[PDB]
Ligand binder design. Sequence first.
Ligand SMILES: *[C@@]([C])([C][O])[C@](*)(=O)[C]([C]C1=[C][C]=[C][C]=[C]1)[N]C(=O)[C]([C]C1=[C][N]C2=C1[C]=[C][C]=[C]2)[N]C(=O)[C]([C])[N]C(=O)C1=C([C])C2=C([C]1)[C]=[C][C]=[C]2
Ligand SMILES: [Mg+2]
Ligand SMILES: [Mg+2]
Ligand SMILES: [Mg+2]
Ligand SMILES: [Mg+2]
Ligand SMILES: [Mg+2]
Ligand SMILES: [Mg+2]
Lengths: 211, 204, 222, 196, 196, 226, 195, 195, 233
Amino acid sequence: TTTLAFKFQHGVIAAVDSRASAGSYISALRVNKVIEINPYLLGTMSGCAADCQYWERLLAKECRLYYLRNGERISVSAASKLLSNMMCQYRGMGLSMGSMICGWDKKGPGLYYVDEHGTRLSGNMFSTGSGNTYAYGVLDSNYKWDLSVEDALYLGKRSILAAAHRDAYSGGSVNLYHVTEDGWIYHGNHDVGELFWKVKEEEGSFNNVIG
Amino acid sequence: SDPSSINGGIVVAMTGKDCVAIACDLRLGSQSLGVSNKFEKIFHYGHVFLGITGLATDVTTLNEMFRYKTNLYKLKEERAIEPETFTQLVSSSLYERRFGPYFVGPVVAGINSKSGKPFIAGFDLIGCIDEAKDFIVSGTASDQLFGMCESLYEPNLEPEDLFETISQALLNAADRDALSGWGAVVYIIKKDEVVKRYLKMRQD
Amino acid sequence: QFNPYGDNGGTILGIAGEDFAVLAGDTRNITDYSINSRYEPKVFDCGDNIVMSANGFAADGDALVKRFKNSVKWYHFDHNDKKLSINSAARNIQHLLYSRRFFPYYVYNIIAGLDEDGKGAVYSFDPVGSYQREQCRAGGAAASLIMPFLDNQVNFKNQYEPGTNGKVKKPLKYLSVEEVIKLVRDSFTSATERHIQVGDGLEILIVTKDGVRKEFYELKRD
Amino acid sequence: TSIMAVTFKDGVILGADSRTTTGAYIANRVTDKLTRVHDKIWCCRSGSAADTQAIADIVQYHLELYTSQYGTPSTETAASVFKELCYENKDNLTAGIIVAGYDDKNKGEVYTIPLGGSVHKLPYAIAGSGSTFIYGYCDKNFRENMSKEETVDFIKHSLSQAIKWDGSSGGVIRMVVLTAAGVERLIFYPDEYEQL
Amino acid sequence: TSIMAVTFKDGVILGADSRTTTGAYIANRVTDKLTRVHDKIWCCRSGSAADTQAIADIVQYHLELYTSQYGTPSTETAASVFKELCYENKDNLTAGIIVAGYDDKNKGEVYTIPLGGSVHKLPYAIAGSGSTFIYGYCDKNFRENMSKEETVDFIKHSLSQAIKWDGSSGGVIRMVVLTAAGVERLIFYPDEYEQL
Amino acid sequence: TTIVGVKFNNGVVIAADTRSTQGPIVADKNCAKLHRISPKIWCAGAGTAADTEAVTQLIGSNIELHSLYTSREPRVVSALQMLKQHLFKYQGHIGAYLIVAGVDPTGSHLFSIHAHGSTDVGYYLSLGSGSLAAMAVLESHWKQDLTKEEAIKLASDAIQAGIWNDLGSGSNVDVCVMEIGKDAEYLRNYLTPNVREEKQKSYKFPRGTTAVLKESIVNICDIQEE
Amino acid sequence: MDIILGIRVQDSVILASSKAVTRGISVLKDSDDKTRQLSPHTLMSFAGEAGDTVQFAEYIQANIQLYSIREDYELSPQAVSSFVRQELAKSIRSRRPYQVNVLIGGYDKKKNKPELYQIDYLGTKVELPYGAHGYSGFYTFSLLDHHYRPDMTTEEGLDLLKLCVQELEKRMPMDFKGVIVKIVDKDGIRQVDDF
Amino acid sequence: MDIILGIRVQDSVILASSKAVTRGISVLKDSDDKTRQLSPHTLMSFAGEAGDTVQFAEYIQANIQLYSIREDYELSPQAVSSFVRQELAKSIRSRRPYQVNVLIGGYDKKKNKPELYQIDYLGTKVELPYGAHGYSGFYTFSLLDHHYRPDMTTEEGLDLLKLCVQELEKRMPMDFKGVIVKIVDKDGIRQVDDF
Amino acid sequence: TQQPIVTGTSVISMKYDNGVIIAADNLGSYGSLLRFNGVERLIPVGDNTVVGISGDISDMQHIERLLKDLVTENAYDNPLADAEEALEPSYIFEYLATVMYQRRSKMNPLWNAIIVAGVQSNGDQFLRYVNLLGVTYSSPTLATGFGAHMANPLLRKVVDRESDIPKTTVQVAEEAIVNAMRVLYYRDARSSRNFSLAIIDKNTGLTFKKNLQVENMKWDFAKDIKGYGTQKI
Ligand SMILES: *[C@@]([C])([C][O])[C@](*)(=O)[C]([C]C1=[C][C]=[C][C]=[C]1)[N]C(=O)[C]([C]C1=[C][N]C2=C1[C]=[C][C]=[C]2)[N]C(=O)[C]([C])[N]C(=O)C1=C([C])C2=C([C]1)[C]=[C][C]=[C]2
Ligand SMILES: [Mg+2]
Ligand SMILES: [Mg+2]
Ligand SMILES: [Mg+2]
Ligand SMILES: [Mg+2]
Ligand SMILES: [Mg+2]
Ligand SMILES: [Mg+2]
């Protein structure tokens, strides 16, 4: 996997790839690595697929119960902490789960990194998975707070593409999300095969590759 | 750690009607990292073609070795080496390193210049010959290639049909292997003309 | 030391049509280089127009199927004979699998049926419960042999329209049940040739609004 | 260790050597391996001395309590108690026990309980490290319905050879005779049995 | 494997079973373990078949070359060649060989060469996995200066018991008689020896 | 692999299946496991396939030179002795397990040979993963004073047992008959009970289906004149 | 050692190599030059196990210098790279292999072209427009894939290289103490003293 | 995490803690605050295994805050340090110990004295004028041994701390991304925003 | 987790037109030592089922008692215990299969391989296998251990598929089983000449044959075999 997420002026962008592996074998070309916890909360997935699905869907159960008891939506900070607390119970039992909890609440846009060690980090930008280093390269050199929604979506899209190309265990397609104060907005599934050639021509990048 | 899967890559060869085809991907990697998209795995010594998968240093080394040996063969014999003879030379050369082998999966392809008979062969890293009539596969997606070749292949295909069959076998096998892809090349070989085609494929 | 796991071989294949679905699997059961049975059913009708196959370690596969069949029974008791939808069965099976996250059911599981809009559905699992709805999936010993063939012949991957030269793809026309069964039989015949754990027989379960139908075909016994 | 139990016309005889080793050191050269769990139900012990003593003590307790409630237990019943302990605790035990007893109804009976906790009823049984060397001899020389004197000679000659070849076996040859007449202890010293 | 060599009045007899195993599979049930290194010097082989065949072949070569130069070698000389090979290559060998031969001067002689490469001259010798079960029987029943018929019966009864208890032993009982009269091969089938 | 050897009245016969595997995958469906050491001495090998070939070619080469040196036809005991001494020297690292059979001026012979250098003699033998299935047939049906026709039948039946019941064995049956006073007859694909059935569909593609970037002519000819 | 980068632009090859040398838990030197001039128009950078790197580089240097004197002629970068590869391929099956990865940057005076060759310790050679060894490529190749053109000037090559080092300095856990940058072109080899 | 330093001067305690957080080969964050306020005049910095550090610190924080509310009274730094030590000594013999090292900097309002306590994951407590955990002390203690006086001002304490960080930045192989510095005195806890 | 100590080797079986046959030798091995020569490894349950067990004998004796207790328990408050509500082969098998899979899931297996042979109420043949892993399968021929490798190939020549079952008589099936037991005696180093054989027929019921011996053995050809290659004498 490669996933990324970053805060900016108009909310938060979340972008993930869609590959799954079993050794050298590509076991799935199109897995959904984002979970729609609620209309204003997203969760990215990296690591053990089963762990990612089970625990993030259990988080959604627990975030829904929060709304029923309090009559109000859970904060991104509290949601990320519930998840990190789940990880601390199965501490050292061998789980493998790296995730970003993205959303919009009363403090504005929120982004938290959570992993199987019980780590919980707040920040403006994160990227997880086998191809996160490739994504960080593009993000760090092009990121601004003053990005437009159009330019921001492209940055997350282009950053996954960079990782999909170089990282053998990343690829398939790109899933884009944009989180606003009216909720998350899905910005489609983008095949990397087609996207690569498109970006190559329009941008002039990947000069070394022949097409 | 496994030398046969550090760099990745695949090779496939097929027989047709009065023709043969051999194809390979272009990837070279360091495990998960893609390093080169121009690492061709097919070489030719006269009219005999050799594709080699496995550890890239041994691929390069063996090419240089068989170039060396076929150039001397030609000077002494006063003729180019034939596929059947070269196949035995490859087998001999690999087995001489029985207890310190080259981590490779070679594949020979060519047409006998005298008999006109199409010929392909494959080996394990230690020299055992697999002289198949239909097709030979090698690489990190060998299982995938076996499945594709076994279902797509039919005997006595014409050069321009064989091209489509071998290309589709390679492309779709590579797209189910993390360590293969990043481009592909197909050689279509006839008794006195050889065409080389670079395929367009997904670059992930 | 006692090894609680084993490998009984076999291979399974699920394909979703427009208004139907198939779940196929070979009938050979093996340990190491020996044959246990040439006919040991692997794909089961679980009720509510759902078919299931858990391939890998037969003991764990039989246990899972037995448990899901039981889950269907208790779903009827607890919820006024309501029909268990394919998406609800899939989610239920996820929890059955993850209940053993630390001592897994050693199986690749596939279910097939129809969704609530009457369209064909296939769901695929890993041994620890990750699942998703798919159009095409091969599982088991010869899964890596078969899947690429299906990417090519079912989803028309790397196939373009002649004359355009790579500019326009082959359009994704739907497949009939007769066309799908051909791809299934050719997939297993090809797998039988190149995989030693695949052979003896092929059993296909076809799901439509009318119910569950079976088709059996012989395979090579070597 | 070299132990055996042999049925004959009038009942059963248990026999054993007297050597206990810790490696190559002989920790005890006059061990009594013939142990009583009931009046006329005895056992021969092989394996871990700690394990076999702990077991025989528990069995003796069970049969004493059985007797208080239900009267004299059968040899089969005694063997079952041994088995139940040896089988259910097989992971933590290293015990090879031969059970031998006399009833008036069933007469002389012999049961062997090897490592796994299985039970085997036999005309005669041999066990211990030294038994390996006398499988051939005992098979060739055993007869059913022997006399007391014949049976004593059979055990004496057999254990003599086991002791001769097995370094873990040696010392004196102890024997216990179980008949209607009662319980007779016997002992045979090296100078007697070595010259056979 | 169950092998033995026994001296008697007129010379010496070698005996062996015919079973060769690869684990629990019987790779050969009619093996000939009685191998000739010289006209009237034979050996019984136990251990690694590869090692023992390679050794016996080398010994046969040495004794053939000895004979060409110095005349008929003694049984002691043959045993020394075996020993020298087994001792100097003990780290890479797993061979247990019994050497048996007849001279007119020395008559019947038996030498055993166990794993380490030591040599032991004996009246009779037993070896192989099945020998353990007949140490007691053979010791009790062996006599010096037996007749040919007595010696054949002794080997037959002995190997019968070894085969009976050892799973690695079985098949037919082969024997080779070494006397002044010449070299006689014998064979005894299951139906004959099992009912003893 | 399943290989057998069977003696009969006036000679010896060997047979083998034709499946070669790399793990659970079938690499070659019609491999030739019956190797020639000399004209009337044939070999069949199980285990490491490269080793069985290399060791067969090597000994066959030396046997030929020996035959030329001595002006005599090669003997099976020579091939046997040369093989076992070579294998013993490499202490089992050359994973060659062979059944060796042939006819020579001494008569007909049948031997088995194991990778560590041990040899056996027999009237009927079997080697490989399918040896147990084949031996079950041989132990059930073998008898003394077999004819040529009975021995070929027994041999192929033994191979079939391996083909059907052993997953490491399959496809066809190869046979070689070595009769005294005759040329050895090699019967490649003596039986063919595993022909693939016709496929339901043809997967021949439309020309132009595959996308192409570049085409070029490859110069395989030498440098030209003028 | 740690990080070595290489980039081939229009008319030159630029090699950047870290300055740090560490023994135990202490950085012994922060100005180490991980490179050797093989010939006037051929430069080799290196990284790998302690000691082996310099020994190998100097051994290669001596052999190329010997060739230059014998023939009064400079070997092409391609020829030198092939010689180096063979030595590493020879080395990997030795009793104790030399654990060294190299980049060879050279300007071919015959073809008037810059050339960059990447060779790892196994003897795995590839000609590239830009290259790296170890973990360096994980951080930098995405930037190079994006920004690289073959018609870039030397100044643009240096600016893209600065961006690569900045990314390394941000996301790498290890402090490699900056880099020494050297340019290989038609006029020879020179060092960029301010970077 | 990596480096945590502490120094007790005349009228305050200064704690310096690195900002880096690393997973795999990537630095995920360069502004992490490895500290928790236990009470208005007691600060605890921490370093150790991933996840355990924050969980332990927050668990301690909750317990001290609970005590403060129950008694309407702030525990002395000595009392807090003893409570923390016992929890770590309890932890080391547990099924899965908490792998956390801490420094506790507090100002005792009763005695009008700053206090610095160093406690490792085994429950090994020592009161010190200056302290560190892991390898940090190997580089810094020689400077502190030389320059430290007990009558130092807060400004002099910061200058000596800058010298310690500069030495770490020179001789440590790892890039710890600078430090966040916090001062604990009679008026409470404040952060030095420019360092 | 344990290791097997005293062990029983192959159990072989097959279906024929009117029922099933099952056989197993009477040996209890202690490693390479052929320790116990009077061990019954076929255990009848009622008059319609025979359970054949290989592997650890102590665990076999435990299973033997479970089955004996099962019959007792089935008779409790059951007026039709010897009729409609009698124990079926399928009931007995599924019970054992449940036990085996539970024990392996607790990492404390019964170190056995079991074949349940019998005839159901409706006259249908029952033949199913289960082992220490809880793995179950059914086939016209079933065999454990060495029997799987050597007996199945011989028995599958008689009944190769389901359609061959009605064509196979009891005389042919018994003959095949007896030949298979001989082959196992030739080639299995942990087998004995003495064995037991059981036939469960839908008409003639349960026939249990004890003290059977392997006969008509071929050994004569051994006399001609000399040396290991070059030796003539
Ligand atoms: C990268 C593609 C690879 O690292 C990414 O991390 C994905 C994340 C992911 C998240 C949600 C859903 C799917 C994928 N990881 C994987 O694909 C992992 C990588 C992995 C293999 N072993 C392992 C891993 C990670 C950590 C510890 C151990 N792959 C898996 O978990 C495998 C087992 N998943 C499958 O095989 C799946 C199949 C088949 C399948 C899945 C998952 C989901 C739906 C249908 C079918
Ligand atoms: Mg990729
Ligand atoms: Mg790929
Ligand atoms: Mg098959
Ligand atoms: Mg040896
Ligand atoms: Mg025996
Ligand atoms: Mg490289």
